[PDB]
Structure formats: structure tokens, C-alpha cells
Amino acid sequence: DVDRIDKLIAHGEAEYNKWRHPDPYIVPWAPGGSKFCRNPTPPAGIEIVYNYGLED
Amino acid sequence: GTLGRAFYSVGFWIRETGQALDRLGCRLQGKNYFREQLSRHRTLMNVFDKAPIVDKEAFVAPSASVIGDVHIGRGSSIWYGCVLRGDVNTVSVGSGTNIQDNSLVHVAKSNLSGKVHPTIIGDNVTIGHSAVLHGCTVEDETFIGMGATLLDGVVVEKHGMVAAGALVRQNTRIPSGEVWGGNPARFLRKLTDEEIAFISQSATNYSNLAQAHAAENAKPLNVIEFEKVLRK
Numbered sequence: 564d565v566d567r568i569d570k571l572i573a574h575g576e577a578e579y580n581k582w583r584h585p586d587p588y589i590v591p592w593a594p595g596g597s598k599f600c601r602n603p604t605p606p607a608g609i610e611i612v613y614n615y616g617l618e619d
Numbered sequence: 620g621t622l623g624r625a626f627y628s629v630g631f632w633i634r635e636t637g638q639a640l641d642r643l644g645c646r647l648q649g650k651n652y653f654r655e656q657l658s659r660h661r662t663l664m665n666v667f668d669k670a671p672i673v674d675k676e677a678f679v680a681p682s683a684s685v686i687g688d689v690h691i692g693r694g695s696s697i698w699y700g701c702v703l704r705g706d707v708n709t710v711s712v713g714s715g716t717n718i719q720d721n722s723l724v725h726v727a728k729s730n731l732s733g734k735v736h737p738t739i740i741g742d743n744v745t746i747g748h749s750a751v752l753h754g755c756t757v758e759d760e761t762f763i764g765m766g767a768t769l770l771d772g773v774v775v776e777k778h779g780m781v782a783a784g785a786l787v788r789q790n791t792r793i794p795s796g797e798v799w800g801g802n803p804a805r806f807l808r809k810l811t812d813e814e815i816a817f818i819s820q821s822a823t824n825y826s827n828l829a830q831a832h833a834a835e836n837a838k839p840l841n842v843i844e845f846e847k848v849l850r851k
């Protein structure tokens with residue numbers, strides 16, 4: 564029944580959110596870890612001009 | 620350098636003061652022949668310190684306007700209406716070549732567009748009519764078509780005949796003995812041997828014809844027309 568699932572999912576979510584382990588596991592290179600953006604790969608396309616500020 | 624330009628300006632000042640004194644003296648006598656609209660053109664116009672150098676054996680048409688640092692080689696012809704201008708850099712014209720009617724050579728006046736490239740013309744280069752070489756180097760023994768639009772940075776090497784109405788893009792060399800034409804310059808075929816001989820043949824005939832003109836175009840002024848113009 565569709566009437567006996569919404570209450571169940573609400574109860575499950577409420578019970579699950581009650582304990583969270585405030586320090587969950589995140590992989591260090593994962594988005595939130597201890598070495599996220601440690602030494603990221605340089606951007607794909609960028610160039611550096613040399614002779615700028617010259618005259619004539 | 621800078622000091623020379625100061626003396627040049629002082630020369631203008633003193634020359635104009637003397638010219639004004641001359642005009643006052645002439646006008647005080649009751650003569651106003653200084654008010655004529657005579658064409659103040661020089662076929663060898665210069666700037667402060669360029670003074671175009673031309674070889675004595677070369678021929679330059681009266682309608683030609685050689686301006687700047689233009690150097691002219693031995694036996695080359697400078698025909699009517701050409702606007703060879705060489706102010707910024709040298710414009711070397713080879714020995715035995717020819718610059719036909721209503722042509723010109725730039726030096727790419729404005730220095731904004733990168734560096735200005737001097738124009739170099741090789742020997743026996745049969746530059747065509749209405750050539751608009753925009754400051755490009757051209758090697759010896761080659762032909763340039765009528766209505767060509769060579770731009771700066773182009774290296775037309777030896778025997779690189781260029782078809783009429785060409786618009787060869789800047790910094791695009793023409794291979795030796797290969798013709799480039801159309802809009803833009805695209806490969807058409809390879810240069811043939813009879814045309815290879817014909818290029819030098821045409822150069823020699825044009826040089827001889829220029830010698831004939833220079834023999835006949837240096838005739839005295841024929842004061843009959845001078846009297847005709849005044850008497851009206």
C-alpha cells in the first residue's frame with residue numbers, strides 16, 4: 564500500500580537522523596577529507612604570454 | 620638624430636622667411652606670378668633623412684612618386700603612376716627588374732600591426748601592372764601577375780610566378796616554380812620551362828623599352844608648348 568510507506572519512510576528517516584556519529588568517515592581525497600585538493604592536477608588549457616607591456 | 624631635425628626645422632624657418640621676403644619684393648614691383656597653381660610634385664620626394672637613392676642607369680617615369688628610403692638598382696624601370704613609398708624602412712629594388720604602370724609598394728606605415736617588414740625586390744623580377752605589394756620580400760627571377768595583392772611577410776622565392784588577381788595571404792611563401800592564384804592564393808599548377816625563359820625575355824625587352832623611353836623622355840622641354848600655354 565502507498566498509504567503504509569510514507570509513514571514508514573518518515574519514521575525511518577527520523578530514527579536514522581537521531582544518531583549521526585558527528586565525525587563520520589570521509590576518504591582523505593574525497594570531497595571533505597583530510598587531503599582534498601592536496602595537489603590537484605593543473606587546469607587543462609591555460610597559456611602564459613611572454614612579451615607583454617612592450618612598445619612599438 | 621634629434622639634433623639634425625632641429626637644424627632641418629630651422630632651415631624651414633629661414634627658407635620661409637626668405638621666401639616671404641621674395642614674395643614681398645615681387646609683389647611690391649607689381650607682379651603676382653607667385654600665385655599660380657603650379658603642380659608642386661617631385662618625382663623623388665623624400666623625408667628628413669631618407670633621400671631616395673636611384674642608380675643613374677635606371678629609368679624613372681615623371682608620374683612616378685618615389686618616396687622615402689627607396690633604393691633602385693641598375694637597369695630597372697620605374698614606370699608611370701607607380702607609388703613606391705619607403706619612409707619607414709628600406710625598399711630595395713633589384714637590378715634589371717621593372718615596376719609597371721599604376722603599381723605601388725608599401726612599407727606598412729602603421730607600426731601598430733606588429734613589426735614593420737622592409738620590402739626586398741630581387742633581380743629580373745617582372746612585377747606586373749597594378750601590383751600592390753604590401754611590404755613583402757620577393758626573390759630574383761620571378762613574375763608577379765597583374766592585379767596581384769601581395770601582403771606583408773610573404774616570401775616569393777625564385778621563379779615563383781604569381782597569377783593575376785592574386786591575394787596571397789600574409790606570411791605565406793610561394794614555392795619555387797609554382798603558380799598561386801585566385802581568392803585567396805591557391806595552388807594551380809607548376810611553372811613550365813617556356814614561361815621560365817619568357818620571364819627573363821620579358822624582363823630584357825622591358826628594360827630595353829625603358830632605355831628607349833629614357834632616351835626619348837629626356838628630350839628638352841619643347842618651349843613651343845610653353846608659349847602655347849601662356850598665349851591664351
Ligand SMILES: CCCCCC(=O)OC[C@H](COP(=O)(O)OC[C@H](N)C(=O)O)OC(=O)CCCCC
Pocket residue numbers: 639640642643646
Ligand atoms: C619680413 C617678411 C614680411 C612679409 C610680409 C607679408 O608677407 O605679409 C603677409 C602676412 C599675411 O598677409 P596674407 O594673408 O595676405 O599673406 C599673403 C602671402 N602669405 C604672402 O606672402 O604674400 O602678413 C603678416 O601676417 C605679417 C604681419 C606682421 C609683419 C611685420
